[PDB]
Design an enzyme around this catalytic site. Structure first.
Site, PDB file in Angstrom:
ATOM      1  N   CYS A  84     -13.504  43.308 -24.034  1.00 33.02           N
ATOM      2  CA  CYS A  84     -13.691  44.317 -25.082  1.00 33.02           C
ATOM      3  C   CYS A  84     -14.667  43.908 -26.177  1.00 33.02           C
ATOM      4  O   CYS A  84     -15.477  44.720 -26.633  1.00 33.02           O
ATOM      5  CB  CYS A  84     -12.349  44.709 -25.714  1.00 33.02           C
TER       6      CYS A  84
ATOM      7  N   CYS B 182     -12.889  49.175 -27.265  1.00 33.92           N
ATOM      8  CA  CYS B 182     -14.299  48.965 -26.937  1.00 33.92           C
ATOM      9  C   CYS B 182     -15.000  50.272 -26.569  1.00 33.92           C
ATOM     10  O   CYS B 182     -14.369  51.326 -26.453  1.00 33.92           O
ATOM     11  CB  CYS B 182     -14.457  47.919 -25.814  1.00 33.92           C
TER      12      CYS B 182
ATOM     13  N   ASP C 257     -13.787  51.966 -23.281  1.00 34.65           N
ATOM     14  CA  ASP C 257     -12.500  52.621 -23.459  1.00 34.65           C
ATOM     15  C   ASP C 257     -12.667  54.051 -23.938  1.00 34.65           C
ATOM     16  O   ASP C 257     -11.942  54.947 -23.506  1.00 34.65           O
ATOM     17  CB  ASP C 257     -11.626  51.846 -24.452  1.00 34.65           C
TER      18      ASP C 257
HETATM   19 HG   LIG Z   1     -11.997  47.421 -23.614  1.00 35.89          HG
END
Ligand SMILES: [Hg+2]
Length: 208
Positions: free
Chosen positions: A159, A96, A99
């Site tokens: 996510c 995502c 991240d």
């Molecule tokens: Hg994530």
């Protein structure tokens, strides 16, 4: 604006057993090399029995493996996603948008991140280092956040809702058609990076 609930719930979703953070950082550093990671490699880096590595990973239900049973995805992944995450000459991916903002500090390396706006399809990119972001293109880039669920698979619950957008107004327009997602919020990429920094501070403080 108030980011504590996000930090708290993401920490809870990520840190499900003792040693998760101990394992996660070395794992991310190994994945960033661009090759599948065997449990025995992690065992060696950590000085753990491979059994223990396995037990930590078992609680990490979203972990991706390849046909050989080696680890290929845990936040950072070798399997294509909408978030390209490049470290030097290795093209990796991330689960995502958030991240991509978190991992560079944890790996100790600068990443070139590229994606597309979830609302308009426009290319977006930035350079993310352990301490700051640069070359934000376009400059007003935004990120969507939701409140992570504690007992749910983190990819399904968090996510998949955490994207980059070309701008805050564009993201807010998109968000107006996304009711019923607990804690849905639009922030600038700068605000998201600061969230990532606070998350990392708490995560790292839980390592041995
Ligand atoms: Hg994530």
């Amino acid at each position: 604006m108030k980011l504590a609930p996000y930090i708290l719930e993401l920490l809870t979703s990520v840190n499900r057993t003792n040693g998760t953070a101990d394992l996660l950082v070395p794992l991310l550093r190994e994945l960033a090399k661009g090759r599948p990671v065997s449990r025995t490699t992690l065992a060696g880096i950590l000085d753990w029995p491979a059994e223990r590595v396995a037990a930590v990973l078992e609680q990490a239900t979203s972990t991706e493996y390849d046909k050989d049973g080696n680890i290929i995805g845990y936040g950072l992944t070798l399997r294509e996603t909408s978030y390209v995450f490049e470290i030097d000459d290795r093209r990796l991916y991330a689960w995502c948008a958030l991240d991509t903002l978190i991992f560079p500090a944890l790996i100790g390396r600068t990443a070139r991140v590229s994606s597309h706006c979830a609302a308009t399809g426009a290319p977006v990119s930035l350079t993310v280092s352990p301490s700051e972001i640069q070359a934000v293109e376009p400059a007003g880039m935004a990120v969507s956040l939701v409140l992570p669920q504690e007992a749910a698979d983190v990819r399904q619950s968090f996510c998949c809702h955490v994207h980059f957008f070309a701008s805050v107004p564009t993201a807010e327009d998109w968000a107006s058609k996304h009711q019923g997602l607990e804690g849905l919020a639009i922030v600038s990429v700068h605000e998201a990076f600061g969230l990532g920094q606070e998350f990392n501070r708490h995560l790292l403080q839980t390592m041995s």
